[PDB]
């Protein structure tokens, strides 16, 4: 039983890519660049 070597390797590569993608989802401290303008 267990993973075949190809399945193992594909899983590691896919999870490295997924962790990179998830890390790229964070926002920088300036990311929500909000434009200001008004008119008891």
């Amino acid at each position: 039983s267990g993973y075949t070597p190809d399945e193992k390797l594909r899983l590691q590569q896919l999870r490295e890519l997924r962790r990179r993608w998830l890390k790229d989802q964070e926002l920088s401290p300036r990311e929500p660049v909000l434009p200001p303008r008004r008119v008891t």
């Binding site: 989802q25 964070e26 926002l27 401290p29 990311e31």
Partner: protein
């Protein structure tokens, strides 16, 4: 904690723009209409019922009560 993440969602620009445009045009014509109705009600309208004086034949628009309807 600086764990702020990006929320994936469809664009709200076009729906918001349509709602703003529709509200703008509806209000553009309806605010003067409401103001005019209020002024007519306060300063002019609400005729009172009276008997027809003898020998006088009223006009067709004199049988109605509200000034706008008249």
């Amino acid at each position: 904690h600086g764990k702020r993440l990006f929320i994936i969602k469809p664009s709200g620009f076009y729906d918001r723009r349509f709602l703003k445009l529709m509200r703008f045009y509806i209000l553009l014509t309806g605010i003067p209409v409401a103001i005019g109705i209020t002024l007519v009600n306060v300063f002019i309208g609400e005729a009172e019922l009276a008997d027809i004086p003898e020998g006088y034949v009223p006009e067709h628009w004199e049988y109605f009560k509200h000034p706008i309807s008249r």
